[PDB]
Amino acid sequence: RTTIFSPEGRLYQVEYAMEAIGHAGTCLGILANDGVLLAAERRNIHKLLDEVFFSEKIYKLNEDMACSVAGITSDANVLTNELRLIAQRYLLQYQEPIPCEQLVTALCDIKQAYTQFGGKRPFGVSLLYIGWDKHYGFQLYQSDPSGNYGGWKATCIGNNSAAAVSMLKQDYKEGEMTLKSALALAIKVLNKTMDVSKLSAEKVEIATLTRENGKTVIRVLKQKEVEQLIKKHEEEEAKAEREK
Amino acid sequence: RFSPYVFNGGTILAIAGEDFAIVASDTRLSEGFSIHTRDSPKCYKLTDKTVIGCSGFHGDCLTLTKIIEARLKMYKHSNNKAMTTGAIAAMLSTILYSRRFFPYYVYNIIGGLDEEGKGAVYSFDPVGSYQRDSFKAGGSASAMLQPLLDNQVGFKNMQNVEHVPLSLDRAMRLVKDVFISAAERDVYTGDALRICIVTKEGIREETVSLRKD
Amino acid sequence: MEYLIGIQGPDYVLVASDRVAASNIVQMKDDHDKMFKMSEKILLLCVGEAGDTVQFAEYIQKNVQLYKMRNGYELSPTAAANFTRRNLADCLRSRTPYHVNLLLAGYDEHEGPALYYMDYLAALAKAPFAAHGYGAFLTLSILDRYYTPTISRERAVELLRKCLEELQKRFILNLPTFSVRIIDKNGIHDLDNISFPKQ
Amino acid sequence: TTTLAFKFRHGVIVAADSRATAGAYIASQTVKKVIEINPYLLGTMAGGAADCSFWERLLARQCRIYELRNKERISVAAASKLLANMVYQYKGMGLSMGTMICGWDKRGPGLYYVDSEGNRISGATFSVGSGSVYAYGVMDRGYSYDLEVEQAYDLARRAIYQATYRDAYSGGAVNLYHVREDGWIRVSSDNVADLHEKYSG
Amino acid sequence: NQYDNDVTVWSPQGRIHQIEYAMEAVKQGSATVGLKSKTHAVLVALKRAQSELAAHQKKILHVDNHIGISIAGLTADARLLCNFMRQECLDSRFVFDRPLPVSRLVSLIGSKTQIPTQRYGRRPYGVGLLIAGYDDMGPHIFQTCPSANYFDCRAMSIGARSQSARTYLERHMSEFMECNLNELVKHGLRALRETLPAEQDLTTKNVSIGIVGKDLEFTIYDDDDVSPFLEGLEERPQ
Amino acid sequence: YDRAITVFSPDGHLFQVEYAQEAVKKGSTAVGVRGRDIVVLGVEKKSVAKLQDERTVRKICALDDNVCMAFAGLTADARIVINRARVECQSHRLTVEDPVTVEYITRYIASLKQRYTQSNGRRPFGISALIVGFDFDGTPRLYQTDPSGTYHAWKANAIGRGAKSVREFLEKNYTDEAIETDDLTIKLVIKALLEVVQSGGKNIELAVMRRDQSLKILNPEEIEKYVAEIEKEKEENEKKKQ
Amino acid sequence: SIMSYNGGAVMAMKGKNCVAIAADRRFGIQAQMVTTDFQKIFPMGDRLYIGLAGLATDVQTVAQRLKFRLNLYELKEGRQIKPYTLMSMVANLLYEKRFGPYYTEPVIAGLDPKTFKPFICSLDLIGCPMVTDDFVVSGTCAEQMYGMCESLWEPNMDPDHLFETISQAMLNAVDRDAVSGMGVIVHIIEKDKITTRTLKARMD
Amino acid sequence: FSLTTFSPSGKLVQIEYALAAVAGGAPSVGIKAANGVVLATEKKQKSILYDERSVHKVEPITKHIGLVYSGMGPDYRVLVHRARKLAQQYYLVYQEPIPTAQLVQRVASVMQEYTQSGGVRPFGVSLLICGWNEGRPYLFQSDPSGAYFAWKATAMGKNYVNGKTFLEKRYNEDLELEDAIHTAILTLKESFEGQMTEDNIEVGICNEAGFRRLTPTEVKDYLAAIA
Amino acid sequence: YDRGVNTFSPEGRLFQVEYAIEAIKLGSTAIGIQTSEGVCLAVEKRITSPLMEPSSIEKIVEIDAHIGCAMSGLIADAKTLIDKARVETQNHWFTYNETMTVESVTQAVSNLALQFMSRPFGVALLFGGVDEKGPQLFHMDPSGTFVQCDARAIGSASEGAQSSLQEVYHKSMTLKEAIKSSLIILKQVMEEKLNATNIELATVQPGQNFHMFTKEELEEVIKDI
């Protein structure tokens, strides 16, 4: 149980909830100067699945924020409603959008209380948050099931996160990262990590966050808009095989 | 419509001395222009050293004394001693402010002995503001008794006088003289005069008749 | 009754207030201050019932400073105004309603100066100038007469002085001395007090 | 009722009547309207005597616990705001209190007026009761922060005397106190009939 | 063996062992004796000290002007039940202005202590009481048990080594009725003495007495007020 | 009587309270030194990861103008304790207009932690806190709080991985001489943090408070200067004079 | 009266494939004007607006608490709101205070975001909707605006004429109400554009 | 055993065992044609005494939403009631009939309420929720975990794998509501251990006109491999 | 039977309550002595580092101007019970306007131990003060059992200290002599050099309030040892 320490000062339910995320789909984020994006993989791959929704794993929380999740999905549907309530409570209280760190603190204060108060299970969900505010600009955060958030410039959660992290360490070009550069890196990291090869456009989900005339924008790239990103990858690594 | 109060008459008096304390009262109980009974004393013995008088609405007079009697036993259980006059007074001050927004319509006078044998008289309002005094009157004729006590005990507006301390035999005659006169002008002051004297030897009682008109 | 006055300019917000607390007929204090410093670039001036003013204003300043502690940066004046107006309005149909008339003044690096008027019914409105009390009826005509949006600090203080001379002439109460304070990009500054040698 | 208090060079003076009244009848003329809250704090009584006494005894109960928990004597401002926030939770229910809190702390001589309505003001001169307006005049023409101690005593005594002369619900004795850095000290208890002789001829 | 760790569990033989174990906590306290004549009721206890240089534990408690108890078992249960009794008697004087009978108090005590025997999350009261009182039906001596049961008694002793006192009382019951107070107290003291070793004897320090009667409120005699009652005891050999 | 419940042991121990201190023996080292008009604490850094914004790894956290705080142990429990202390720092100015003192809020935090050792269904806060600050009368203060709800006052202390080795350092070194100026009070903390550090200087973060100033976190441009001064004063004394 | 403590005036009027909405710009206590740029029309989406006349506290409170619900709605939902449904949301919001009522009488005007047919509605302070097909009014000058819209309104009106109609009604109505005026603002909303105008009005 | 407990692998075991109770219930088919949705299931009795016109595995929630399940009928009758209440709450607030996706969300919330406390077991049912909103058909699949999936066709219960491969090899778009019923009955005929009668199955369809449970006559019509 | 406070042993015992007693011997030792001139309290501090300010180790405290406490055991239990005693002593003043006796403070503080909070308090306390009945010393135990004592020692070396007090104690002593005896006993149960920071000492006389000794007054008795 979660209200019990180990002799070595450990909390093993909090570690098992964190081990319950590698079973979930891979989701990464990439920060840039022009914007910030997310990239999830759709393990819901089947000939009879419909895909009615706008997006299955990218959830919009505010006019200036979205999130992606990995882990237990019921827990995600709980936390995504709580996030949307926190944002609107801040708006009602101040009539200004909530910054992209107060929301993460507010959700992590909920996640911390489940590791501490008797008969309830820690949320087996990690999250990534992308958003804009008038204090620090474009941001990217990463929550854990223990109630620990951290700011990042590029991170990955879920299956094969430790490999995408090593790739981003070896290909991120801080200070010179546009949004086309970030998507070109995403299509690479998400192809050198997926078990199913060739990276079908049906098997991914991408969202970009940008600004236009003092308004925030959160779009979702369509199928044909991602086919181009894929086609401009095998060409790129076919040229890195020409020089034999 | 239903008003929860009614004035049942009553008059009470207390005088303190260096080795004694008196608490007196009439015995008439009234209701408007009628008379309920002519044997209903307003004095109640609490301890061997302490006596209380109660005047006003009679239901509160009955409730409050029972509350006091139930608190004395709890004090004795917890502290293994009987209470003092000042402790009872300070406790009653809180019991009365417990009802600050629905008060006990009761005019109270405590009379007993200090912790070195001297007299002690504590007079209360219906909401618990208390005041140690040498003599105090309370009830319907309170406006009639206190001037003569101010004169014949405090020696006020009297020059070149012997400021003699009040002995018990003088105090008792004085106490009888004031009710004999309050029964002539106040219509609530009635049939008998109960007097409870407190001394180091114990507590006595005396009944003296008044006019039944 | 008590008097507040506020004036907004292109790069500043001037505010004043009387320094009088009063029992039935006598003045109990002449060194009184009705301003409450919420932040380095926000003020709150409050008038109303005796206890509601200090309780309400202390609550708001603590809940505004707690923002700075938790988050590391200030609240805007537009956000503090709506926090104040949300807490004044939740309490209105309750068992503890605050009867308080107040101004709010501040400066932000992005939006510039701001002045907000509020009534005891929690209706927020930003204006270029504003007043409270029975002196408003006299001193709002002078502001409408002589105020311009490009008014400078030195002329703003002269307009204020005229507004208070009109109180000393016509107003049925004394109001002998006044606090004066100004806000700008460099914070709050306690200007010299506009007094009147009545006695 | 009539009370007054002013703070000057050598601390705070406190004076008061001794009369209680229920309409036209004079119930008591030996009332102690200055409440010894602690050995280092003083109160006054004006309005509800039962309200003044109860809530200031409750204030004492918290001041002592403060001193025990923290091993430091409370301030005058803190002692005043305790009482104010306590009597603000009964606003409109019908309490009547007007009382000054007097004392010396690390900031200096302190004087604070607290009302059941919710006022809480710091000042150098205050008077409360029906006879307050008759004391304000004398105490205003006769004030100076550089007063001497006996002069301050005389001022307080004569202001209470002149207030008792006019007001009907004010009389009896004049009980005068003096707040210092070594605590407070009771000075006098002077009948108004005595001072009548000396201040007439 | 394994129907013992809870009071809500029966055994295959129809027994609750936690209650039987709570009854064993009365045998850990010092011995008390209770007895009654037709006019008076007496409790005599033997007090026990923790360190030699301390005061003896108080064994007899005042409940009202006509009821008093002597306790053997856990101190905390006794302190809770005494405060229950005191308020139940004050509640009777407040309403009816009469003293509460003793049968109607011990019935309430049983009704109170029956709950921990049946609901889980509460411990059975591991204290036994001997209750001496006087009402409109004469003197009474009541035993109260951790099993939520209670008995009306001519006399009784409870605590460690109380079978000796019980054996003594069982063969002198025919005298207690017409005994005066001195003889009754002496029978109690002798029954108590029968619980000691032959080494020890009764002393002012380790004897408390409680008496109630028609013209006598419940009084307690502890240290030097006991020496009248000790004078008269035959110096027993062994 | 063994692990897994806060009941007791035959020896008279509560092991779930010791196992929480064992979590405080697992975080990063955090030291604190009390001077006359400067008070300095420093905390080891958390091994940055080449793609992380370190603006959010705040180990040192202010509670009011006069009081500050540094913690070791669980990172999330720290945030709740710090917010619940920040609230009380303002509720204390509401209840009485005076500001707060260091012992008041230390006592409050310790009571909050004590409250979580009383019930099952509540887990103790797995942190300690060095709570340094100022007062009226300008008396510098330093306290240390453990999960069990115990608080003491210290001239200098340490918490985390390596506190058992920094305590010996400060035992051998802390005197009235090393608190002559502010620059000597800071060099002591630098040398103490060096005893567990990466032999760097970029793995250090120090803050200071004066009777006048508010909290002031240092930049590496001064940390490097202090560390170079300390490296020079040790190249000259320990080596070039022995 | 209550709602006359602050004043106000709101009107809505349909055309053919368009709709209008108008309000005065004054904020004042009983008889004193404080501010002349007070908001009383609030957007609730593109091609959908709402207007509020009554007690200003309740205006701001209702607008904020409705934007709360609308944002949560269109987040859970994946679609912008229809006017018929905003009407019922407001009705529920107001009937929740059936004995603590907000002192407002809203006016809604919009176009359905698929077929773009116009909609206009009115509600009372406890939420009885009123879906007319000509015009709706709420405020202190309700009779004066009924009298103008009854006489000037025509069934089919292009925006150039609808603007003139809804302006000449509002101006001549608020010019006979003492606590309404100090400016008039108008919104015209079509499938392709939203036009917004402030008008030359009396400031007495 | 316990439900508020993770395994070291990071699995919730009682949820996995509640899905095993779904995997052993009667089969249920679901197909989403272009102009409708079909729901079909096996309603077979243990004797000739059971009156089959008294209980229903196909139930309506509204005029335009309907249900089937695989697993436990007692658990089904709770979620039927809850869904019927939630639809009416939505109507009471908005005066619009609830969309088929919001009901699935609010019902998975109910299924998730029973996954987080101790002293409660999850539901032993999965659902298939058909609808017709905004001129488009819908079909979802709610699970005891609190998770839902939108399908074009699927099968739950006994032999839910071969019954799904059959649909993968024998289902496409450009169908209509009558070509899909034949396919659903053919997908049920795989597991039918006996002669399929009009009373051994139960069928419900949704379309522009709304949801309707077919009658035994209509079942016997298409049971002849007709349409 | 060992774990849980709602479980009786076959012999009718509560082992958790006894293990709460055993938590007192893990605390340093304290001594209290009655005398007709007053009461004394004397304790060891057990400083673990020279860096900690030993004045932050509250092992003797003021409950009121006429009652002082000395404790041994868990710190949290002690904080709770000391706050209880302080609050009760002032509620008594508020109601009755007099000083609570040491017996009644002890009685009221022991009533919290009678509450299964879910755990017995792991702390014993000595209460020294002056009443109408003169100087009084009391001892409270985790079982809520309290009794008047003439001399008592609690804590780690309570056995040897008690086995010495029974010899050096008589009911005729003075306070200066009892203070000397207490420190002589304290000297013998310490493997650290007795000094004016390793101990506290307090007294409560009739005509004087609670008074914790200073370094000067302490060294001026350490010298005559």
| DSSP string across D167-186 | -TT--SEEEEEEEETTEEEE
- Torsion over CA of A45, A48, A50 and A55, rounded to 10 degrees? -10
Q: D1 an active-site residue?
A: yes
D46 touches chain B (CB under 8 A): no
Helices (H), chain C: 50-71, 77-90, 136-146, 153-170
Closest CB to D118 among C21, C31, C51: C51
Chain A contact partners (≥3 CB pairs within 8 A)? C, F, G, H
| Residue F94, both tokens | 């509401």
**Structural domain tally of chain G?**
1
Domain of residue I123: give its range: 1-225
End-to-end CA distance of chain A: 57
- Torsion over CA of D43, D48, D51 and D57, rounded to 10 degrees? 30
| Residue C52, both tokens | 């509601």
Asked if A157 and A163 touch (Cβ cutoff 8 Å), the reply is: no
Q: Sketch out chain A's domains with CATH numbers.
A: 12-240 (3.60.20.10)
What are phi and psi for residue A33, nearest 5 degrees?
A: -85, -30
In 3-state terms, what secondary structure has residue E143?
strand
Secondary structure, 3-state, E39-67: CEEEEEECCCCCCCCECCCCCEEEEECCE
- The Cα–Cα gap between C134 and C3 comes to 7
Domain of residue H136: give its range: 1-227
Core vs surface per residue F173-202: b (16+ CB within 10 A) or e: ebeeebbeebeebbbbbbbbbbebbeeebe
Q: Do D136 and C26 touch (CB under 8 A)?
A: yes
**Which residue, B202, B156, B201, B194, is CA-closest to B175?**
B194
A181 membership: H or E segment, kind and range? helix A179-189
Q: What is the largest CA-CA distance in chain G?
A: 48
Residues of C in contact with G6 (CB under 8 A): 123
Asked if I12 and I142 touch (Cβ cutoff 8 Å), the reply is: no
What is the separation of C-alpha B137 from the centre of its chain, rounded to a whole number of angstroms? 7
- The Cα–Cα gap between C158 and C156 comes to 5
User: Hey, which residues does A216 pair with through a beta bridge?
Assistant: A211
Residues of G in contact with H102 (CB under 8 A): 76-77
**Structural domain tally of chain I?**
1
Distant-in-sequence, close-in-space partners of E179: CB < 8 Å, separation ≥ 6:
E37, E187
What are phi and psi for residue G159, nearest 5 degrees?
A: -65, -35
- The Cα–Cα gap between B189 and B180 comes to 9
Question: ∠ at Cα H35 (H34, H40), nearest 5°?
Answer: 90
Chain F contact partners (≥3 CB pairs within 8 A)? A, C, D, I
- The Cα–Cα gap between H70 and H39 comes to 12
**Which residue, I196, I201, I221, is CA-closest to I211?**
I201
Q: Do C127 and G35 touch (CB under 8 A)?
A: yes
In 3-state terms, what secondary structure has residue B30?
strand
- The Cα–Cα gap between F99 and F93 comes to 6
Distant-in-sequence, close-in-space partners of F95: CB < 8 Å, separation ≥ 6:
D81, D82, D85
- The Cα–Cα gap between H222 and H201 comes to 12
β-strands D125-129, G135-139: how paired? unpaired
Binding-site annotation: residue ranges of D for bortezomib? 49
- The Cα–Cα gap between G178 and I9 comes to 89
- The Cα–Cα gap between E75 and I107 comes to 12
- Amino acid F133 reads G
Catalogue the long-range contacts made by G121-124 (C-beta closer than 8 Å, 24 or more residues apart): G121/G83, G121/G87, G123/G87, G123/G90, G123/G91, G123/G94, G124/G94
Residue H194 φ/ψ region, left for φ over 0, alpha for ψ in the -120 to 50 degree band, beta for the rest: left
- Amino acid F178 reads A
Distant-in-sequence, close-in-space partners of F74: CB < 8 Å, separation ≥ 6:
F23, F27, F125, F126, F127
Closest CB to E126 among I8, I148, I151: I8
- Amino acid B12 reads I
Distant-in-sequence, close-in-space partners of G143: CB < 8 Å, separation ≥ 6:
none
- The Cα–Cα gap between E82 and B77 comes to 10
Q: How many CB pairs under 8 A join A and H?
A: 79
Question: ∠ at Cα F195 (F191, F198), nearest 5°?
Answer: 105
What are phi and psi for residue I109, nearest 5 degrees?
A: -80, -30
Domain of residue C155: give its range: 1-199
G16 touches chain A (CB under 8 A): no
- The Cα–Cα gap between A36 and I193 comes to 68
Asked if I203 and I65 touch (Cβ cutoff 8 Å), the reply is: no
**Which residue, A62, A60, A55, is CA-closest to A25?**
A55
**Which residue, F106, F91, F117, F144, is CA-closest to F17?**
F117
Residues of D in contact with B142 (CB under 8 A): 25
Distant-in-sequence, close-in-space partners of A197: CB < 8 Å, separation ≥ 6:
A191
DSSP letter (8 states) at residue A49: B
- The Cα–Cα gap between A226 and A234 comes to 13
Distant-in-sequence, close-in-space partners of A46: CB < 8 Å, separation ≥ 6:
none
Distant-in-sequence, close-in-space partners of B1: CB < 8 Å, separation ≥ 6:
none
Asked if I223 and I151 touch (Cβ cutoff 8 Å), the reply is: no
Residue H195 φ/ψ region, left for φ over 0, alpha for ψ in the -120 to 50 degree band, beta for the rest: beta
Helices (H), chain H: 13-22, 73-94, 100-113, 162-169, 177-189, 216-222
For the four alpha carbons of B56, B57, B62 and B66, in that order, the dihedral sign comes to negative
What are phi and psi for residue H41, nearest 5 degrees?
A: -155, 165
Angle of the H73-94 helix axis to the G83-95 helix axis, nearest 10 = 90
Asked if H79 and H111 touch (Cβ cutoff 8 Å), the reply is: yes
- The Cα–Cα gap between F166 and F157 comes to 8
Domain of residue G45: give its range: 1-204
Q: Do F7 and I119 touch (CB under 8 A)?
A: yes
Q: Do B101 and D94 touch (CB under 8 A)?
A: yes
- The Cα–Cα gap between D46 and D53 comes to 10
- The Cα–Cα gap between C28 and C38 comes to 26
Give chain I's contact residues with B (Cβ, < 8 Å): 94-98, 101, 103-104, 107-108
User: Hey, which residues does G19 pair with through a beta bridge?
Assistant: G14, G189
**Structural domain tally of chain H?**
1
**Which residue, I100, I157, I158, is CA-closest to I131?**
I100
Closest CB to H4 among A52, A78, A121: A121
What does H78-116 look like in DSSP terms, one character per residue? HHHHHHHHHHHHHHHHHSSPPPHHHHHHHHHHHHHHTTS
D163 membership: H or E segment, kind and range? helix D149-166
Distant-in-sequence, close-in-space partners of F62: CB < 8 Å, separation ≥ 6:
C69, F68, F69, F214, F215
| Residue B141, both tokens | 């004729």
| Residue B93, both tokens | 């001050």
- The Cα–Cα gap between I225 and I221 comes to 7
- The Cα–Cα gap between F122 and A51 comes to 43
- The Cα–Cα gap between D177 and D5 comes to 10
Question: ∠ at Cα D91 (D122, D12), nearest 5°?
Answer: 20
Helices (H), B80-126: 85-97
| Residue G10, both tokens | 């709101």
| Residue D57, both tokens | 């005894």
Q: Do you know the residue count of chain H?
A: 227
Asked if H141 and H149 touch (Cβ cutoff 8 Å), the reply is: yes
Residue D108's CB: how many other CB atoms inside 10 A? 10
- Torsion over CA of I128, I129, I134 and I137, rounded to 10 degrees? -10
Q: Do I51 and F9 touch (CB under 8 A)?
A: no
- The Cα–Cα gap between B14 and B112 comes to 10
In 3-state terms, what secondary structure has residue I21?
helix
- The Cα–Cα gap between I178 and I175 comes to 5
The shares of helix, strand and coil residues in chain H, as percent rounded to the nearest 5, are 35, 25, 45
Distant-in-sequence, close-in-space partners of H150: CB < 8 Å, separation ≥ 6:
A49, A50, A51, A52, A53, H138, H139, H140, H141
Is it the case that chain F and chain G have 3 or more CB pairs lying under 8 Å apart? no
Q: What is the largest CA-CA distance in chain D?
A: 55
E93 membership: H or E segment, kind and range? helix E75-96
What does H32-60 look like in DSSP terms, one character per residue? E-SS-EEEEEE---SSSSS-TTS--SSEE
Helices (H), chain I: 15-22, 75-96, 102-110, 158-168, 175-187, 215-222
End-to-end CA distance of chain D: 26
In 3-state terms, what secondary structure has residue D72?
coil
Asked if F174 and I51 touch (Cβ cutoff 8 Å), the reply is: yes
Core vs surface per residue H185-195: b (16+ CB within 10 A) or e: bebbeebeeee
DSSP letter (8 states) at residue F156: E
G65 touches chain A (CB under 8 A): yes
Distant-in-sequence, close-in-space partners of E154: CB < 8 Å, separation ≥ 6:
E35, E36, E141, E173, E176
Q: How many CB pairs under 8 A join B and E?
A: 13
Helices (H), chain F: 15-24, 75-95, 102-114, 163-173, 182-194, 220-234
Asked if E34 and E153 touch (Cβ cutoff 8 Å), the reply is: yes
Asked if A80 and A69 touch (Cβ cutoff 8 Å), the reply is: yes
β-strands C42-48, C35-37: how paired? antiparallel
Q: Do C50 and D117 touch (CB under 8 A)?
A: yes
**Which residue, B117, B154, B116, is CA-closest to B135?**
B154
C62 touches chain F (CB under 8 A): yes
| Residue C54, both tokens | 């200090």
- The Cα–Cα gap between F159 and F162 comes to 8
| Residue F190, both tokens | 């630098």
Question: ∠ at Cα I15 (I10, I20), nearest 5°?
Answer: 165
End-to-end CA distance of chain F: 57
Place of tokens 């204060």: A109
- The Cα–Cα gap between H176 and H227 comes to 11
- The Cα–Cα gap between A31 and A152 comes to 8
- The Cα–Cα gap between D123 and D109 comes to 11
Distant-in-sequence, close-in-space partners of G97: CB < 8 Å, separation ≥ 6:
G126
